[PDB]
Design a protein around this motif. Sequence first.
Motif, mmCIF file in Angstrom:
data_model
loop_
_atom_site.group_PDB
_atom_site.id
_atom_site.type_symbol
_atom_site.label_atom_id
_atom_site.label_comp_id
_atom_site.label_asym_id
_atom_site.label_seq_id
_atom_site.Cartn_x
_atom_site.Cartn_y
_atom_site.Cartn_z
ATOM 1 N N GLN A 1 30.342 6.522 30.752
ATOM 2 C CA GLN A 1 29.385 6.803 30.259
ATOM 3 C C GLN A 1 30.029 7.319 29.322
ATOM 4 O O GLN A 1 28.724 7.706 27.593
ATOM 5 N N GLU B 1 21.065 7.735 35.029
ATOM 6 C CA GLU B 1 21.780 7.403 33.273
ATOM 7 C C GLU B 1 20.865 6.681 32.788
ATOM 8 O O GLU B 1 21.613 6.093 31.522
ATOM 9 N N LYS C 1 31.606 8.540 36.888
ATOM 10 C CA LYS C 1 30.164 7.895 36.027
ATOM 11 C C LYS C 1 30.290 8.620 34.091
ATOM 12 O O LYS C 1 29.875 8.543 33.125
ATOM 13 N N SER D 1 24.215 11.327 34.504
ATOM 14 C CA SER D 1 25.224 10.032 34.914
ATOM 15 C C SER D 1 25.542 9.411 36.425
ATOM 16 O O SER D 1 25.335 8.119 37.022
ATOM 17 N N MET D 2 24.886 10.629 36.719
ATOM 18 C CA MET D 2 24.566 10.272 38.311
ATOM 19 C C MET D 2 23.718 9.960 39.008
ATOM 20 O O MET D 2 23.308 9.992 39.727
#
Length: 222
Positions: free
Chosen positions: A205, A62, A201, A58-59
Amino acid sequence: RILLKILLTILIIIALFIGIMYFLSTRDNVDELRKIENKSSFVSADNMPEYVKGAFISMEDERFYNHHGFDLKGTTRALFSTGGSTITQQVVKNYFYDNDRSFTRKVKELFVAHRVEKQYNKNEILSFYLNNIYFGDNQYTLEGAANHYFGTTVNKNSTTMSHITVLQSAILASKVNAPSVYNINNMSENFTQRVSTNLEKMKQQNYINETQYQQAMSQLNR
Ligand SMILES: [Mg+2]
Ligand SMILES: [Mg+2]
């Protein structure tokens, strides 16, 4: 017929360049990546909790599982549009170019990345990633880093060691591309802000639920 010959000559000189570039990237043998699995603390991504993988995905990338080494959105945004290397590209950089960073060494990195995608599956790539990035304190594997900073493990199966928390996952994920000055041993406000973004995030997500998030956010603030 005068603007077709200077267009052809430039169009050929670049194709020639790109071509030579290809040959340079060869090799740069992606079979070498398998050596990462020999580290005393190697743990493959499939033996890690999904939130540990998601902290990084996610970082850092993604759309990891979607692409084939090159993320167009993140690479156009990357061309200074107020990033932008996919996790695959970072694996190439970290293993082969532990040294340089040039435009030409950037073109050949693309060729090599396409090759690791062609030869490895996403879980293998992710495993090369997390077992060969710097987490500070001379730690180059996720598990080493987890052991060292927190004394927790990222092997979901493990029973001999406490399990890395959501917060800890975000911290290590945030560290990877943070400025070198970000210190997990004494996190600055700029670091806690970075991990809060990471945690956000993961929530957005859906690698974590609201409760995991809040509880991480809370731990982050003690
Ligand atoms: Mg992201
Ligand atoms: Mg990219």
